[PDB]
Symmetry: C3
Subunit: 189 residues, 3 copies
Amino acid sequence: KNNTLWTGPKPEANCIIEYGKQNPDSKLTLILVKNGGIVNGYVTLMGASDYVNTLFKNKNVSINVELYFDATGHILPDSSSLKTDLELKYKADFSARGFMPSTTAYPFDLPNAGTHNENYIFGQCYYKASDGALFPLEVTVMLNKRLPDSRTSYVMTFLWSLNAGLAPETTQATLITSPFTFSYIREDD
Amino acid sequence: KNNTLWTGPKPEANCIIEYGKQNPDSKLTLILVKNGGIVNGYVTLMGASDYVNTLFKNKNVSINVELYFDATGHILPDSSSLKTDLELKYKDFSARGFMPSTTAYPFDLPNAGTHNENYIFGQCYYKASDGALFPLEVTVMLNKRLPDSRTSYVMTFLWSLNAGLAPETTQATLITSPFTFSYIREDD
Amino acid sequence: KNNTLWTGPKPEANCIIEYGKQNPDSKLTLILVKNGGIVNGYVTLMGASDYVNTLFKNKNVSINVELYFDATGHILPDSSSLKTDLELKYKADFSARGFMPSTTAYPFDLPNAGTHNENYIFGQCYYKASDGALFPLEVTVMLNKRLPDSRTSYVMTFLWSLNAGLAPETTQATLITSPFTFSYIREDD
């Protein structure tokens, strides 16, 4: 009851990966579930353009998704990679502050006070290549460390890194990052 | 509170690994917990036969567990590796809400298309009798292909050992360390 | 709703790492959330002494945290690494038995019977070095193999291992283990 904030189970292209592109080129599935004092997160990315679906023709690739939220936990679409706000599973006015990363646990760096390296979550997911070969993707989640502007209250970024000895593909193949799950200390409701 | 569908915390031999065997040869612990729009899963396998407990005498091993469910999320024991249906933590009723979403994880349709979004990959470990720790590459396949006309949902597990040397030279209880995963669940 | 037993989102030094030290030298963040028949755990360690914050000047380091609980799931501070009991996020006169690792799933070994290897959870987290290098830490969780004494009912230990070919640091830097998440079969409420 009021505990899931997401993109939907199978969204249409809603995310921009290629710098300078005006329209979505990928499908970001992001699910944030409230579970006690923590949020259980689920993230997957699917390519929806020739650019995104040919990135894995290279053995060294970095994919960035930046999410910026206002004071009531709503996506700022102008600056964020995700161009459509998240919605509640049973949805439409509401405060999604309780789904946000805690500024107590994950603070914002202050000039001359030193960096907050406790704001990163590292893990791994995979890319299953068209030939069936399995490539690991190194994942970095950064919570609130640095703001992009004066309009943002919370930050959640994702980075998928491919660092292989050989390229996964020689042709266009749908980019799919296997589901990556993570948990963080949430802000007060 | 109607949110855990499981095998029990420490089940008796309930799963068949060896092809052609008629009776259980392993103990599958599977816990499926409803948590908002997702299911939080927990899986571990323990060997319960000489065959299963001597598999790790080889450097290359694949262990497959196939689970097939009906329209109300109940195990089809004839076709599944698990020979006993899952049960709620408190005593029927529909387990549809614990099933993998056919929207998020569809079934491949004959012309053009594989749904590679139906795989969850991760890792767990085998602690050998000598104390060496071996990684096991885990693949979970949700839906994607049906075995027959009786099945509505699919959940398969594969544990792969691909080592430079065999973990064992003798029989030792096979134990895969706990593997946790999450998936978008079907409507209640 | 009585479902989170934790240290707090950002605790003060509450843990002892250095053998023979009498006062806390580290900050252990431990969050235990009840979710059906399982507990969803979250653990992070931050150094709070010159000793702990110079451990990564070595390429081979092992960090151990031992937690011993009574029959009602309360920390025994005399023997445990954590020197302050866990508390409920919302609700001190409570029972935390339901947050404990199951003695059915994770039994205690018996003399001459051969060990319970089902009691371990293995995984990985990282240390982000002052120069941005990312070092993996091999994590082992134990749960209930052996009791330290006649006062303990439940056990939960953590081991972070660094086994690098070079040292992450040449100077003092705050030790931070990136968030490690795990799940275990819980005891009855």
